[PDB]
């Protein structure tokens, strides 16, 4: 299971905002994605964490940092803008032994 907290976060433009994605189980082969929801609740990939590296899709303000306990991650939006306001989640995939995808509940960001 995955949690993504706080469920609601409100910050002023320019704030460097953080959500925390927390995994029940961490594995070295796990790949972790940070998604945003569209108006039709489609997932849209923002960044990924794989092989110890954070990789933004198209906006480098979206950064993922794995914390020392390996199971918790900070999903950081640097220098927030009003257009960042929306719903986000995290999702993890494992390939072995079988394929397994899990998603956290959504969390809402409001940037004012």
């Amino acid at each position: 299971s995955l949690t993504f907290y706080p469920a609601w976060l409100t910050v002023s433009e320019g704030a460097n905002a953080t959500f925390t994605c927390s995994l029940s189980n961490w594995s070295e082969d796990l790949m972790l994605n940070w998604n945003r929801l569209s108006p039709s609740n489609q997932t849209e990939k923002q960044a990924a964490f794989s092989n110890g590296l954070s990789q933004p899709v198209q906006d480098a303000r979206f950064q993922i940092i794995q914390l020392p306990n390996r199971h918790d991650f900070h999903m950081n939006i640097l220098d927030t803008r009003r257009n960042d306001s929306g719903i986000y989640l995290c999702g993890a995939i494992s390939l072995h032994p079988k394929l397994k995808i899990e998603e956290s509940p959504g969390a809402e960001l409001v940037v004012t």
């Binding site: 790949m31 994605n33 039709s40 609740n41 489609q42 997932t43 990939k45 990924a48 794989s50 092989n51 990789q55 899709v57 198209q58 999702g91 995939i93 390939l95 394929l99 995808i101």
Partner: protein, 186 residues
């Protein structure tokens, strides 16, 4: 990597008994290690109904073919593509429909009362409403589910038979935006 998957169409509307081809596109710039799959999300296990048309993979398209779609195939799916140390996915929704095109009709005279009883019955999907054209007396309309998940809708009208009048039962399938009808001559 910068690997992403996109879904050009999010909602597929499918006639029961016909195929779908569910599509997700991916970034070719980001081939041997590509793994594309489709899960039905209800848990989210890999689909046993869909066949990957793997010849489209070189074009940057994951296309999954499901033959003879049934009501139980309706719902949300997830397409997933993994490319090396990266992955992405999209959700797709299959909505199903079945026209209320075959309408069976019956006419009976009700013993004792002198009234006539008119029945229309049809199967389709989703649930149709029935009305009887230019009839003030309300009918009794009900439904069951068929083994394949369709609705069988039955409408029964009981009234004094007025001379030279035909009765028309009108099935309204709101989701399809379809009106179908049958005429009964008593």
């Amino acid at each position: 990597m910068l690997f992403t998957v996109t879904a050009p169409k999010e909602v597929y509307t499918v006639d029961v008994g016909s195929s779908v081809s569910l599509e997700c596109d991916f970034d070719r710039r980001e081939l041997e290690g590509i793994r594309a799959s489709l899960q039905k999300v209800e848990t989210s296990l890999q689909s046993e109904r869909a066949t990957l048309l793997e010849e489209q993979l070189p074009l940057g398209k994951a296309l999954f073919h499901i033959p003879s779609v049934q009501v139980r195939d309706s719902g949300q799916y997830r397409c997933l593509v993994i490319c090396g140390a990266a992955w992405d996915y999209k959700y797709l929704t299959v909505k199903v429909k079945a026209s209320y095109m075959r309408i069976d009709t019956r006419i009976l005279e009700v013993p004792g009362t002198g009234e006539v009883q008119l029945t229309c019955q049809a199967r389709g999907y989703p649930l149709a409403e029935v009305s009887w054209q230019n009839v003030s007396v309300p009918a009794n309309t009900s439904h069951i589910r068929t083994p394949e998940g369709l609705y069988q809708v039955t409408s029964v009208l009981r009234l004094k038979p007025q001379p030279s009048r035909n009765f028309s039962c009108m099935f309204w399938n709101a989701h399809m935006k379809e009106l179908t009808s049958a005429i009964i001559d008593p």
